[PDB]
Motif scaffolding. Structure first.
Motif, mmCIF file in Angstrom:
data_model
loop_
_atom_site.group_PDB
_atom_site.id
_atom_site.type_symbol
_atom_site.label_atom_id
_atom_site.label_comp_id
_atom_site.label_asym_id
_atom_site.label_seq_id
_atom_site.Cartn_x
_atom_site.Cartn_y
_atom_site.Cartn_z
ATOM 1 N N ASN A 127 -0.282 3.231 -12.389
ATOM 2 C CA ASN A 127 -1.566 2.618 -12.016
ATOM 3 C C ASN A 127 -2.789 3.118 -12.786
ATOM 4 O O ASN A 127 -3.915 3.143 -12.262
ATOM 5 C CB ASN A 127 -1.799 2.772 -10.490
ATOM 6 C CG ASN A 127 -1.490 4.208 -9.940
ATOM 7 O OD1 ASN A 127 -2.000 5.232 -10.449
ATOM 8 N ND2 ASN A 127 -0.674 4.266 -8.869
ATOM 9 N N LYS A 128 -2.539 3.523 -14.026
ATOM 10 C CA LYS A 128 -3.562 4.029 -14.914
ATOM 11 C C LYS A 128 -3.638 3.070 -16.072
ATOM 12 O O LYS A 128 -4.231 3.372 -17.113
ATOM 13 C CB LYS A 128 -3.186 5.430 -15.377
ATOM 14 C CG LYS A 128 -3.191 6.448 -14.234
ATOM 15 C CD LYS A 128 -4.494 7.272 -14.168
ATOM 16 C CE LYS A 128 -5.802 6.514 -14.535
ATOM 17 N NZ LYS A 128 -6.080 6.275 -16.012
ATOM 18 N N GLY B 124 -5.280 -0.554 -12.917
ATOM 19 C CA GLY B 124 -4.498 -0.636 -11.718
ATOM 20 C C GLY B 124 -3.103 -0.839 -12.151
ATOM 21 O O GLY B 124 -2.853 -1.038 -13.315
ATOM 22 N N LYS B 125 -2.206 -0.836 -11.193
ATOM 23 C CA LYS B 125 -0.796 -1.014 -11.440
ATOM 24 C C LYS B 125 -0.596 -2.375 -12.039
ATOM 25 O O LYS B 125 -1.036 -3.361 -11.472
ATOM 26 C CB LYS B 125 -0.039 -0.921 -10.110
ATOM 27 C CG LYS B 125 1.508 -0.651 -10.173
ATOM 28 C CD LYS B 125 2.040 -0.037 -8.821
ATOM 29 C CE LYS B 125 3.576 0.048 -8.709
ATOM 30 N NZ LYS B 125 4.293 -1.282 -8.648
ATOM 31 N N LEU C 213 -3.837 0.799 -1.359
ATOM 32 C CA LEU C 213 -3.363 -0.102 -2.368
ATOM 33 C C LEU C 213 -2.018 0.296 -2.836
ATOM 34 O O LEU C 213 -1.187 -0.552 -3.138
ATOM 35 C CB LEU C 213 -4.265 -0.088 -3.589
ATOM 36 C CG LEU C 213 -5.668 -0.636 -3.485
ATOM 37 C CD1 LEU C 213 -6.266 -0.628 -4.862
ATOM 38 C CD2 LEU C 213 -5.666 -2.033 -2.936
ATOM 39 N N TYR C 214 -1.811 1.588 -2.983
ATOM 40 C CA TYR C 214 -0.530 2.015 -3.496
ATOM 41 C C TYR C 214 0.311 2.907 -2.557
ATOM 42 O O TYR C 214 -0.236 3.670 -1.742
ATOM 43 C CB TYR C 214 -0.764 2.659 -4.871
ATOM 44 C CG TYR C 214 -1.479 1.761 -5.894
ATOM 45 C CD1 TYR C 214 -0.944 0.542 -6.288
ATOM 46 C CD2 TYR C 214 -2.670 2.157 -6.483
ATOM 47 C CE1 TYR C 214 -1.576 -0.242 -7.244
ATOM 48 C CE2 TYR C 214 -3.306 1.361 -7.439
ATOM 49 C CZ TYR C 214 -2.755 0.172 -7.810
ATOM 50 O OH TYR C 214 -3.391 -0.601 -8.743
ATOM 51 N N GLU C 215 1.633 2.696 -2.598
ATOM 52 C CA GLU C 215 2.585 3.479 -1.795
ATOM 53 C C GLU C 215 2.695 4.874 -2.447
ATOM 54 O O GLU C 215 2.916 4.931 -3.691
ATOM 55 C CB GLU C 215 3.979 2.777 -1.718
ATOM 56 C CG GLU C 215 5.225 3.671 -1.339
ATOM 57 C CD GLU C 215 5.547 3.830 0.187
ATOM 58 O OE1 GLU C 215 6.128 2.878 0.786
ATOM 59 O OE2 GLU C 215 5.301 4.928 0.777
ATOM 60 N N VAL D 206 3.880 -3.117 -3.926
ATOM 61 C CA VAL D 206 4.961 -3.834 -3.269
ATOM 62 C C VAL D 206 5.197 -3.156 -1.927
ATOM 63 O O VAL D 206 5.534 -3.779 -0.906
ATOM 64 C CB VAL D 206 6.213 -3.796 -4.208
ATOM 65 C CG1 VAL D 206 6.560 -2.346 -4.584
ATOM 66 C CG2 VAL D 206 7.409 -4.486 -3.576
ATOM 67 N N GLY D 207 4.981 -1.852 -1.941
ATOM 68 C CA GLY D 207 5.113 -1.086 -0.722
ATOM 69 C C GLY D 207 3.974 -1.472 0.192
ATOM 70 O O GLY D 207 4.149 -1.638 1.393
ATOM 71 N N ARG D 208 2.783 -1.570 -0.389
ATOM 72 C CA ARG D 208 1.591 -1.952 0.346
ATOM 73 C C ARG D 208 1.396 -3.357 -0.105
ATOM 74 O O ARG D 208 0.913 -3.600 -1.223
ATOM 75 C CB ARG D 208 0.357 -1.130 -0.053
ATOM 76 C CG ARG D 208 0.526 0.357 -0.032
ATOM 77 C CD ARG D 208 1.281 0.806 1.199
ATOM 78 N NE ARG D 208 1.388 2.260 1.236
ATOM 79 C CZ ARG D 208 2.351 2.931 1.855
ATOM 80 N NH1 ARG D 208 3.319 2.269 2.490
ATOM 81 N NH2 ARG D 208 2.339 4.271 1.836
#
Lengths: 150, 150, 150, 150, 150, 150
Positions: free
Chosen positions: A2-3, A79-80, A148-150, D111-113
């Motif tokens: 995600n960078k 972001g991813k 936003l991210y797991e 995808v997780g979130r």
């Protein structure tokens, strides 16, 4: 990771049709973090640098002429899979065939005037980012929403 | 005259809450022309310069701390009575009492974190514009929509 | 303090006209945290309890009849001055005179059918909250966005 | 038949990112009738019940942890082919590949979130509906807009 | 009574700036029923008829010139206090001072080009309605949403 | 060529569900120029004329009945590939399978009541345009935004 960052430019028609707020807002909703933002009128060499990949083509002249015919709002989001998504969000080359929901499908109608630019790959992304922005202009400490991210 | 410009800055909370696209879009709808735009992290002296009017006050420290605690999206819009309107659009000091429809009334809830800044007068406007932007960064050839003015 | 909660109910017309998502979304934008939410058809006694303040009045019957004539989406939001704001957001009694931007000014047109209910004071708020929701149904650990408050 | 119901849950990230009003509103626009709605923090057993289908999998633990790590807004909509549509509206598993226009394509990025849950079939729908809601909590007399169906 | 009708015209600038859908949509949300709608280019006599009240004034010429300088989307809405509300929704004479939330406050910026026209009283309403529309063009059987009025 | 026009009609359900402003606005955003617009209740022969292609079919009766069962807002938009796009924007036959972002995918839920009509080809377009509008009613001097086409 995600960078990942991409480069997008609201071309002169997008800016001149008042699409700037809409476009940035769309990426902010999606969750991407705005790392760099500046309105500028591209210069001949910058434009020629940007549309390098086409300099051997006939229609390279147009490209360059237009992109410099008026202010452009350049920006870099991170972001991813940002490079992948952004394109998805922006639509196809021909605005008319871009699907409703996409930037070009909603507001676009020509192909020459297709409102926005998005790096087509992560490689063109880093070339484009560094080309339009000075490192000084880009955020470092991004820190994206933790929901936003797991 | 429609060559009036104002200075607005989406403070750190506005930027960090994803209000950037919404805010620019609101002024683009109203008809104002975006003349300058850049995301930057204000520096101590710039912040102290900007919140000069309060340097003799106790709560000047906060002002400065915050404004520099994160990126800020600075921009300059131009149009007839832009300085007056922009304020109207932005709301009052206390977000809670700002009316629905206004930037702070719709998204604001505190007073310290009130999302946006707008020059309070045409005088503070020109001081603020020149303070945050270099002439290079500002448009010259504005040319506003002809359906806007009689 | 930002631990203030208010009680709002999208009455039968609001729910039946599809205004539920719009209304919740408006308060989420403003920054308030949703603490309790449930769609239910009010019962005679609950309605009579809720419109107690008017039981000595002729038009109390109507009140009660309506509120129970269809599902109602009840909810409790918490935030700084939430009770005050929510009312501001909702509009005046007469939808027609409610200003554009406000819930009733945007979608309202009658006074009897004025889409939404909001506790009128912090006192009626706590009476209303406890009246429609069981403590079990309300959040405890609220934790509001840190970009909302100084 | 238009008596089909599905179950959707705005997971913790959706709720915590203020997506509740947006999501409900999207289904209300589409024409579906809100039959049940309640914000609750799922409990271990309910979550384990809900993510049963994966209990034999390694990543079942996560599922459960998350779904119970914060409030969730559960709801049941009814309408012609609601189970099918709702999924279409919600997007694919990976938010990034969900198309613009869809819930996950517009606001999703991991995808997780991935903000929301929708029953994947009419069978999982009825299991999920009954699992999260008590019959008491669900509407009976639905009565959908007559301009919706032939 | 809810059989009150008003007359509104999106002037040439409103139409030419793409404000037509926005404006009609705003009144449809509010609950008013569209009774008559037609895009036309006003003719000299119709314009002079419409801006009669000012024919003795110097600035009557302008009025007329403009209103006929391009297509205008004329429409008649009906509802309780429609004439009163519509004005409230449209804003004041000077777009700049019209408040955010109102048609002119959101998109307006000049006074000459103030996007829309709304009958100022019920009297001017009936004169204006009959002046721009032939009875044939107006709905008879209105039948407004039953969730609008008590 | 950008002198292509198509014919669209918001059927009775679209009009009666308040979708008129939304639909016109969508095409105005896309860039298409509104050339003709009028709300009318179709007459038996006009409807039978319009649904000619199906007169030999059993379900032609329905078609006609409905289309004339209430006001319809007819309109003609012009732009590059307008006939093609408009369909793309409107969605598929079955609202349920129309994708989010499209008119029918966002608001549609049945197939019989699918809100809108769009000419299916440029041929049916010119037949439909001339069938519902008198040349008098259509714009001539279109003049589209110059930021739309190269």
């Amino acid at each position: 990771v995600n960078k990942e960052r991409t480069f997008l430019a609201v071309k002169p028609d997008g800016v001149a049709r008042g699409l700037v707020g809409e476009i940035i807002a769309r990426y902010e909703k999606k969750g991407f973090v705005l790392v760099g933002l500046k309105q500028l009128v591209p210069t001949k060499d910058l434009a020629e640098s940007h549309y390098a990949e086409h300099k051997e083509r006939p229609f390279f002249g147009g490209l360059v002429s237009f992109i410099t015919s008026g202010p452009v709002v350049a920006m870099v989001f991170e972001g991813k899979g940002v490079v992948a998504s952004a394109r998805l969000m922006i639509g196809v080359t021909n605005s008319l065939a871009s699907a409703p929901g996409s930037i070009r499908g909603d507001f676009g109608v020509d192909v020459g005037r297709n409102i926005i630019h998005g790096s087509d790959s992560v490689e063109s992304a880093n070339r484009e980012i560094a080309l339009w922005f000075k490192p000084e202009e880009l955020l470092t400490e991004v820190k994206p929403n933790p929901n936003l991210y797991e």
